[PDB]
Amino acid sequence: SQFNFECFVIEDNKEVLYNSVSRFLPKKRRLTFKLSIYPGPGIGDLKIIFCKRNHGQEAKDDLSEDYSISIEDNKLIRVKNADNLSLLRKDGCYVLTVPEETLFRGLHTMEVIVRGNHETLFYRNIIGVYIK
Amino acid sequence: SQFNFECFVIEDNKEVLYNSVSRFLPKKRRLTFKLSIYPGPGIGDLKIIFCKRNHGQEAKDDLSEDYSISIEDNKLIRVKNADNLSLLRKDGCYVLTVPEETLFRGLHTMEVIVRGNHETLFYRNIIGVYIK
């Protein structure tokens, strides 16, 4: 696939794929959300946003974050609230990493939206995480 | 204030600690150099530079890089050639990560220099890597 979106839990200094919303995670785990981009025809300069939200009765705007970046000339441009993001190039693949930590009980989602060529939608995905 | 400086090689999707000049690595391996900062009280703003150099009969200026960052008011400031650097905040320590790839045969070093108030030297360390 040209785009991929994954959540990893840091366990004993290894990244372990989080592959089911059914699995409750304990608090105090580091998470990494990874957007992998394989460039090609029509895929170069991009606008990307990550949307972190929590859900349920105790939904709070306080826990909401948007991380907005652009990729221009294969370089990362921090647009808004994107200081913790990082871009890494590995063998024709660009990986954008968003770090988080499990802290509040309940359902949390991270959504990613990728647009290019004057706002054409290239990719959207979302990962839910349950925390004890 | 306490500092640590470590090098990790990615081997089967895990960060494996690479001790300085402890073995020869093949080409096309990913490396991460991590400076960990355990800030003490009144440490003030910091100026940090990483210096990459290669050594031997084929010492080459085109392989040298300097990555310069500051920590000002507890935020990362990318000063020069620091787009690939990232800063992760953990419980009681900051971690600055410098990614590299093994590409040229011989000895290479990554040196880190940390200065603070009045250009006072707080820390210096260096790690060497052998590449096949």
Interface residue of B83, B94, B96 to substitute, partner A, most A CBs within 10 Å: B83
Distance set, CA A127 to CA A33, A100, A102, B30, B71 (Å):
9, 13, 14, 27, 33
CB A96 within 8 A of CB A69: yes
User: Is A88 at the interface with chain B, CB within 8 A?
Assistant: yes
The DSSP output letter for B118 is G
Q: Number of helices (H) and strands (E), helices first, in chain B?
A: 0, 11
Chain A CB contacts of B86 below 8 Å: 84, 86, 97
Is A84's CB within 8 Å of B83's CB? no
| Cα–Cα distance for residue pair B34/B16, rounded to 1 Å | 12
Of B15, B84, B97, which has the smallest distance from its Cβ to A13's Cβ? B15
CATH code where residue B38 lies = 2.60.40.10
Distance set, CA A93 to CA A2, A79, A87, B30, B101 (Å):
9, 22, 10, 13, 14
Is B30's CB within 8 Å of A83's CB? no
User: Is A10 at the interface with chain B, CB within 8 A?
Assistant: no
- As to burial, measured by CB atoms within 10 angstroms (0-12 exposed, 13-18 middle, 19+ buried), residue A52 is middle
Q: Determined by which method?
A: X-ray
Judging by DSSP bridges, how do beta strands A120-131 and A106-116 pair with one another? Answer: antiparallel
CB B112 within 8 A of CB B35: yes
Spatial CA neighbour of B18 closest among B100, B95, B86, B89: B100
| Cα–Cα distance for residue pair B11/B30, rounded to 1 Å | 8
| Cα–Cα distance for residue pair A18/A23, rounded to 1 Å | 8
Q: Which two tokens stand for residue B67?
A: 């990555």
| Cα–Cα distance for residue pair B84/A90, rounded to 1 Å | 12
Distance set, CA B87 to CA A32, A53, A70, B14, B132 (Å):
14, 23, 19, 19, 30
User: Is A15 at the interface with chain B, CB within 8 A?
Assistant: yes
Per the listing, tokens 């946003």 go with A49
CATH code where residue A91 lies = 2.60.40
CB B40 within 8 A of CB B93: no
Which chain A residue's Cα is nearest to B90? Answer: A30
Of A83, A90, A91, which has the smallest distance from its Cβ to B76's Cβ? A83
Q: How many angstroms away from the CA of A95 is the closest CA of chain B?
A: 12
Spatial CA neighbour of B107 closest among B84, B127, B77, B78: B127
Q: Which two tokens stand for residue B31?
A: 């490396």
The values of phi and psi at residue A99, to 5°, are -90, 145
Q: Which two tokens stand for residue B107?
A: 């000895």
Chain B CB contacts of A99 below 8 Å: 88
Alpha-carbon torsion angle B10, A19, A28, A24, nearest 10: -160
- As to burial, measured by CB atoms within 10 angstroms (0-12 exposed, 13-18 middle, 19+ buried), residue A109 is middle
Q: How many domains does chain A have?
A: 1
Chain B CB contacts of A30 below 8 Å: 90
Of B14, B84, B88, which has the smallest distance from its Cβ to A99's Cβ? B88
Cα A104 to chain centroid, rounded? 18
Q: Which two tokens stand for residue B41?
A: 């009280």
| Cα–Cα distance for residue pair B24/B106, rounded to 1 Å | 9
User: Is A90 at the interface with chain B, CB within 8 A?
Assistant: yes
Is B13's CB within 8 Å of A14's CB? yes
3-state SS of chain A is CCEEEEEEEEECCEEEECCCCCCEECCCCEEEEEEEECCECCECCEEEEEEEEEECCCCCHHHCEEEEEEEECCEEEEEECCCCCEEEECCCCEEEEEEEECCCCEEEEEEEEEEECCCEEEEEEEEEEEEC
The DSSP output letter for B126 is E
| Cα–Cα distance for residue pair A115/A122, rounded to 1 Å | 5
Domain that holds residue A46: 3-131
